[PDB]
Design a protein around this ligand. Structure first.
Ligand SMILES: Nc1ncnc2c1ncn2[C@@H]1O[C@H](COP(=O)(O)OP(=O)(O)NP(=O)(O)O)[C@@H](O)[C@H]1O
Ligand SMILES: Nc1ncnc2c1ncn2[C@@H]1O[C@H](COP(=O)(O)OP(=O)(O)NP(=O)(O)O)[C@@H](O)[C@H]1O
Ligand SMILES: Nc1ncnc2c1ncn2[C@@H]1O[C@H](COP(=O)(O)OP(=O)(O)NP(=O)(O)O)[C@@H](O)[C@H]1O
Ligand SMILES: [Mg+2]
Ligand SMILES: [Mg+2]
Ligand SMILES: [Mg+2]
Lengths: 522, 522, 522
């Protein structure tokens, strides 16, 4: 087969071999374990490509990875798609049965697994069918990955192919069902990297990623491509530090010792870092954390700002690149005091380059951006999944009306800021209105004796759903007093019914399992 | 969206609206039930398109059909792909559990079902999830299909789209596993129609389909697109007769009364037609039957030829268009007596236009075409399925080495004739050689007291498999005598071990279930 | 670059290596010069590919050919596109200045020229810039083509590429302007071959091309791909005879000696063949000539039919494949006497498979097919050129309204027969009506003393054009008598003005130059 050289294909190999800046002596660091350079990283990628080719991996095969944040994961990220194979990212926090389901669904050919998840694989080994090889990863010289890499040469000619070939795949958390498989191509990943770099690098003076930064991930990195940050960092040729296990002390040592300036985490990990005693005598005025898990609270943002940390929220939903929104503050808003700055930073943010992001009601009428009217977000972007893997009913509901349906209810204002209120499946329909469960669950959580609250909604057969607030307490506070306090705030008349429960069911990842609560409590 | 008009897309709507010949007053006949014209057929197709659009069917939806050969099936064949939807063909001869599996796997949106398969649907109705509507078809005016057609107008503007959009899908019989989903696009179907028309219409004087023929199908028509014949006939604008139930008497009346000249069936139906008493006083010297089920025997071919019937074999395997080979006789071979003509007609035939069809061993070395060396057939054609639906392990084994693996062992000769010997999974490996089970099962079936024979193969742990001949008899013939007769023919020394069984297990369609025999008998 | 094997590309190499029928011992014959077999033809094609690769020809280079009908031209037809280069066909009947213009416009890299056109090249050699090599072709062993072929081996691996790569190009005759460059791709040529084979091979009993025919071209073969016949014949594996110079005696010897059954020519050559004395004692009842030049007259058709020749007209216009219409007679019309059969055969014919062919007025309103209303023909087909080479103004006028504008006025009837009346640029607009010049020029040509007549049209500044009939006579017949005879036939009142001229200007090919007549006579 002969192709004309003029036709250019967007490939990940161009992301690695044609960076914005390449520094041969820049360091890739795996926490207290392994330091090497970029000129060693490229040779390592070529060696891994040779080893994969020797192993029988081809243009259609699937390699699954199950480990922590390390140099090996970045090497996989770059080497497996370049061969033409597909990289399946396994969520290690799922239950072993869910992991078995995802492995059978994806039909992986090779499995690279750390030596820490071996007991999990022991339970799920008899019932796995398609895997011809397991490669055990270790933090010492006894690693099979290192043994397989050290036999091959550092020379490899990476092929080019169509830019629409699938590169990566992973599964959703599954709070509402079984996990859903989402996949992306080489083109989509390259475009996402360039679009996000154009959006966040061109900011005037706040929340920008540039070639002088030092990057350390704090998100799982096996979920949403670690927000695409490991790709972007590799394009900038910046120093990269990989922590591994996420122990707050080792993280607060890696920051400081390595002078990390850019990272991204979730509100729980940020709270753990800020509350650790070792952080009380630590300098934080070089750190730019990006919070993208869910619903950055105002108090956490204010405390982080008072610690002189550049904190801003981002919004992505695991099948949209993932990045769709990033908080960017103009220099006029950089004067505002800590309260107003926290208010602006806590929002989901404005849409990134090449994104439509309309707000819509049902039937698709494109509600106005007045700042209080709420509706589902429908988006168009170069890096959206076209459907779900081996699913057609949910794929059909995903792209209804020619737009991707996120399933999140939000209100946009005149300035373009987006504020998510709830999920579509979690809204409470009283008569014809959609009542967000999050707002009144926060109202009830403002009580001193309330530990946690979940609102679901119970059928009335007269007007519709009626909110049901399942509350777990720490002290003795009475059921009637919750209703009295709720009447004292928020109009719900007498429709707020509160039930005291011993525990509130969670999911495997850690989110609240509302479907399980509906199963137990009507 | 704007497309340039110069770019031409191969679509089925071009197959219908730009035929080789269009005759407005040509007849479409449904046996003793409904006669109409082509000028009524086009209006009917447009009415069905309007009804489907009114029903909510869109460019990605799936419509399943479960009925006999009729005008309605042709209307579905043409109207469902033109809308952009996908036509799922349901094999009604499968067991209801297998039908449920295929329905769940395909995720059909609408189901059109005859009133005869309603009891089957009753068993499989609770466990079906994706179907929003069932349309019951009837042979009287009470048909819901006719009621839905008569409400709409005969005007419709059929959209154009990409020629790689999937048009049809169906599942394999499943003699070796569970059924496998295969799909084809608009381009592939159009190319298959044109290629087969070029191959069979240009024959000099034997076995040709031309614009003066009358076409009646005798194959299921819900399996392999009825060999693509209903499309091809519609391109030629020839008279089409649809029998329905396949009763030999009604078939032998439709031939004669309608003067059918071209058809296609399987050896069992042909034997039933030839053995019917009503055929003893019937003229057959205008009929050209195409036999494509499996292994046209020489005796049947000779008797059909003595009845002055133009009989020739065709080879296709349900995921290759299906047509790959057609027997075509040069005018020199038209002189040969009935025995030599039967020998030439019983073969699978030469490859059709735009087909490679190499013979190969294992490891892919492309064995010579000497006429006795046997190997697997590997093909390349414009109309091959790229993979299996929602399957990746079997898809990977399907296209190994860059060629489609049929799984049939055959030998090709210098003239180009192909003769299938067995299936790959049915070959017996004694020491290093592949022994076809079909040849020695025929040898054993030549016995007078043998009713049927199946050869599978039993492990020896010394050289390999050892053939095991499970034989069902009609009379008293002894186990030792089978071995003695086998030694008298065919070198197998003493390796032919014969076991007498009461019955031989079959599959749902009617083929011999060799996997079940291996499960019962070791 | 790696491509998946499932994706199939329509290429000419598949036309050669995957035919409908391949016969190794079938003969390719070059009249009284060279006989070889197909097994020699394939080796010759591979040798030519090796020689072209050795010469520096690449995937974008251009090779021009300037010779007669021979085996070498077929070898070029097949070998040059297979390499990926572009085959430029040079019309040797154009004036040397026009040939220079076309050569400079196309920018040919290599030129293969016969030893007969060498004096023409001598005049046009200084002013040619892009040609790095001339290869002189001869009918003896001193041919440079044979010398270049005999040095290479008969083994070559032909590459595959995109099916939209340009394969052939040539220029129009230029009766209305300068020649216009038209080009076609591999896909278009393959589709044209298959579509025409499906259309003409499936005819019941008249005018069909099958695998038992013997093919000899009588059209230039450097113009419109010789109607695509050399490709189609090669797909059928039929015997091919190439005459060379078109001497009527050698043609009438090649027919008879080689038993040619299928050919195609123009009315002038057919008249010369029928009027030759050697044809008076010749048997013609196996010959099927296809007449596609222009306007097959009824008298010629009747005389050819009385000679027991199967004659039918075809319509194509050098940028539409070219074939768009072929006359096909149903078996009911095969009973009709010679007069009615000649009437039916003289028409342009019905459209071939996959062709729309609407009749339209100006502004595009799609006039009815009543049989007498005339309008321009607008067509859609898989094998139409998308634009003109290096032209954008005429390309824009070519595809106005989303349909290709042929520029011919015709009327279609209820049965689908098309009858061209004139060209759009040749119609005479009296007040608001379009008067065909051909009809009244035939009326005037019915006079005994008229040798030839051309009607152009002279401005009146009152209602519009007024026909002007320039007539060249053989005898003394008077100007007034032409008008009197014209009034005796045909309503033109007194608007038919006739002028006697000594000679009527023709074009380089031989058609009447109406633009030159407008330049000389107002
Ligand atoms: N910045 C944010 N603010 C508020 N909510 C957010 C933010 N980022 C993400 N979310 C929510 O978290 C979700 C992340 O999606 P995902 O990672 O697939 O988990 P999931 O939706 O629970 N998986 P599934 O149960 O299959 O839908 C989004 O759909 C939002 O509902
Ligand atoms: N002319 C023929 N001569 C001999 N065998 C044939 C012929 N035509 C078809 N066959 C056989 O019949 C098969 C038809 O394939 P198909 O309709 O999918 O049934 P199947 O193979 O049993 N389905 P599956 O069990 O999933 O492979 C071919 O694969 C051949 O093995
Ligand atoms: N069967 C036919 N009957 C009548 N006229 C025909 C027939 N076939 C071709 N023609 C005419 O001949 C033309 C052939 O086109 P072509 O070979 O390009 O010559 P041309 O039109 O003179 N070149 P150009 O001057 O650039 O348009 C058609 O456009 C018709 O006008
Ligand atoms: Mg989600
Ligand atoms: Mg099969
Ligand atoms: Mg023209």
């Amino acid at each position: 087969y002969v192709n004309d050289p003029s036709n250019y294909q967007l490939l990940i190999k161009n992301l690695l071999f044609s960076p914005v800046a390449f520094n041969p002596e820049q360091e890739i660091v795996y926490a207290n374990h392994r330091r090497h350079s970029y000129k060693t990283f490229h040779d390592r990628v070529r060696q891994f490509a040779n080893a994969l080719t020797k192993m029988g991996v081809k243009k259609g095969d699937t390699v699954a990875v199950m480990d922590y944040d390390s140099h090996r994961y970045l090497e996989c990220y770059f080497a497996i798609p370049m061969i033409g194979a597909k990289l399946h990212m396994i969520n290690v926090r799922l239950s072993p049965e869910q992991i078995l389901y995802t492995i059978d669904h994806a039909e992986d050919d090779i499995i690279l697994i750390h030596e820490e998840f071996l007991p999990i694989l022991d339970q799920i080994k008899g019932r796995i069918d398609t895997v011809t090889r397991y490669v055990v990863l270790r933090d010492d010289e006894e690693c099979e990955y290192e043994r397989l890499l050290e036999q091959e040469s550092t020379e490899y000619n990476f092929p080019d192919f169509d830019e629409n070939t699938v590169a990566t795949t992973f599964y959703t958390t599954g709070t509402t069902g079984f996990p859903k498989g989402v996949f992306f191509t080489h083109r989509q990943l390259v475009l996402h990297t360039m679009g996000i770099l154009s959006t966040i690098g061109t900011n005037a003076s706040q929340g920008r990623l540039h070639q002088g930064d030092i990057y350390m991930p704090i998100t799982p990195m096996f979920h949403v491509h670690a927000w695409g940050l490991p790709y972007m960092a590799t394009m900038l040729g910046v120093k990269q530090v990989y922590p591994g296990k996420y122990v707050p002390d080792v993280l607060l040592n890696l920051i400081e010792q390595e002078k990390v300036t850019f990272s991204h985490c979730v509100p729980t990990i940020l709270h753990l870092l800020l509350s650790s005693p070792k952080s009380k005598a630590m300098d934080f005025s070089g750190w730019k954390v990006v919070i993208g898990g869910a619903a950055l609270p105002k108090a956490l943002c204010k405390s982080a700002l008072e610690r002189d940390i550049d904190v801003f929220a981002g919004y992505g939903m695991s099948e949209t690149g993932p990045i769709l929104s990033i908080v960017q503050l103009t220099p006029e808003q950089l004067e505002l005091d800590v309260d107003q700055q926290a208010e602006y930073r806590s929002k989901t943010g404005k849409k990134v380059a090449l994104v439509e992001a309309y707000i819509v009601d049902e039937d698709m009428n494109k509600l106005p951006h007045d700042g209080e009217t709420a509706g589902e977000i429908v988006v168009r972007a170069p890096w959206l999944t076209p459907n779900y893997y081996k699913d057609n009913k949910n794929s059909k509901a995903l792209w209804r009306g020619g737009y991707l349906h996120t399933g999140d209810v939000a209100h946009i204002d005149d300035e373009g800021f987006i504020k998510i209120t709830d999920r579509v499946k979690d809204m409470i329909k009283i008569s014809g209105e959609w009542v967000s469960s999050l707002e009144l669950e926060d109202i009830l959580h403002q009580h001193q004796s309330v530990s946690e609250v979940a609102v679901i909604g119970m059928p009335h057969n007269k007007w519709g759903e009626v909110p049901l607030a399942l509350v777990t307490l720490k002290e003795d506070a009475q059921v009637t007093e919750k209703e009295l306090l709720g009447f004292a705030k928020d109009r719900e008349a007498l429709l707020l019914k509160v039930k005291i429960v011993d525990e509130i069911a969670k999911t495997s990842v850690g989110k609240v399992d509302k479907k399980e609560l509906r199963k137990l409590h009507l």
